[PDB]
Amino acid sequence: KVFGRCELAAAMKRHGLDNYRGYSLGNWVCAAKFESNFNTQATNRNTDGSTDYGILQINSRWWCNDGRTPGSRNLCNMPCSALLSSDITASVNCAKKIVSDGNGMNAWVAWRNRCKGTDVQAWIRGCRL
Template sequence: MKAFIVLVALALAAPAFGRTMDRCSLAREMSNLGVPRDQLARWTCIAEHESSYRTGVVGPENYNGSNDYGIFQINNYYWCQPANGRFSYNECALSCNALLTDDITNSVRCAQKILGQQGWSAWSTWKYCDGYLPSIDSCF
């Protein structure tokens, strides 16, 4: 029940901050940030399934008390420092709130670091993005 209340509160608050992108706008921005074009279909798939392309999303509490942040739902136990001061390894050396802004640079850089350390399977939604994906070529 607690998780349901948190989800409802987040859903109501979501329009108040962040922005909603689409597949092509995300692909173009990531390309402009230097992400290899052959990765863009995977990244857009992950963003679709993790956050519905929304930058301002904080996910519900996970089993270990952590939360996931931003367009790629990056976990605060390992990758960013939550505002409440809770322990974090903070491997991306940034505040979790930096993952919630309209500027996706921090989210992209942190997601690339995660990919480099753990691979695509770091995202639980990878199962939807492993295999054939539609081309993003029409976005450019």
């Protein structure tokens, strides 16, 4: 499912992401935008053999099990296919664990390179929240 900007914002808010660990909602919407383009079904394989899954492009080496990443840690205790659902509950629950891991949102390369330090508020502008 390809979410609309305001639709995603509202579902993320409902799920407790606005200001989670100090990150305003605009940050999370911006990250989803550049990581997956708001598409829950997005996947991309990496050179190390791991693969990123879903709306927030969560990596298989550490967070989920896809049964094809030797040495995966599966820290979110779930198969990576779960992160591709139209229901973002799993993705949000896992992202909460990732963002709390010590390096914050820098865990997401697109956030760090395209969202960090920008007016992230523009991402939720015009939405009924």
